[PDB]
Amino acid sequence: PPNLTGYYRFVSQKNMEDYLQALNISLAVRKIALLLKPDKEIEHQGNHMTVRTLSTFRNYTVQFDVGVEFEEDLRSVDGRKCQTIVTWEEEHLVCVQKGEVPNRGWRHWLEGEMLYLELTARDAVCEQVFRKVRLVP
Numbered sequence: 001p002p003n004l005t006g007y008y009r010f011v012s013q014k015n016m017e018d019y020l021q022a023l024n025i026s027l028a029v030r031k032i033a034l035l036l037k038p039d040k041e042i043e044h045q046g047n048h049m050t051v052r053t054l055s056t057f058r059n060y061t062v063q064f065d066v067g068v069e070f071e072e073d074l075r076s077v078d079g080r081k082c083q084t085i086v087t088w089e090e091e092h093l094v095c096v097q098k099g100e101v102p103n104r105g106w107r108h109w110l111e112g113e114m115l116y117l118e119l120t121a122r123d124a125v126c127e128q129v130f131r132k133v134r135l136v137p
């Protein structure tokens with residue numbers, strides 16, 4: 001599987017409204033979240049990954065070894081905890097977050113320097129795109 005290490009700048013998103021509602025995020029917080037352009041930073045070493053979502057209001061970091069289910073602390077996101085498993089399906093990094101919310105998870109994949117992210121919760125599907133930042137001193 002590919003190595004996903006990189007810093008990727010926000011490009012676009014669609015239907016984040018839907019995903020936020022599906023996680024039961026309040027109107028006040030959804031209004032804030034829809035204004036921001038969070039970046040994605042990944043540290044992928046061997047079979048271990050750290051994935052950071054970075055914004056001026058709040059950051060969220062998760063760590064994992066691919067293939068090992070773990071308790072994901074999402075209390076800073078939607079107040080919940082999940083039993084989360086990340087796998088590789090061809091070149092897609094697939095995450096299933098098992099818990100209260102059905103169909104919860106996400107999928108990354110790369111096309112050149114564009115990093116795609118699909119986010120799901122209940123019947124909501126959000127599509128995001130990021131672009132890798134080149135290491136220019």
Ligand SMILES: [C]C1=[C]C([C])=[N+]2C1=C([C][C][C][C][C][C][C][C][C][C]C(=O)O[C][C]([O])[C][O])C1=C([C])[C]=C([C])N1[B]2(F)F
Pocket residue numbers: 016020023025029032033034036038040051052053054055057058059060062076077078106117119
């Ligand atoms: C400010 C605030 C507050 C709060 C609470 N909020 C916000 C916002 C904005 C800011 C940002 C934060 C971070 C998040 C993370 C998760 C997703 C990604 C992910 O999943 O990823 C995936 C891979 O890549 C790893 O992980 C938001 C959004 C945009 C969304 C959401 C849900 N939100 B929330 F409701 F949490």
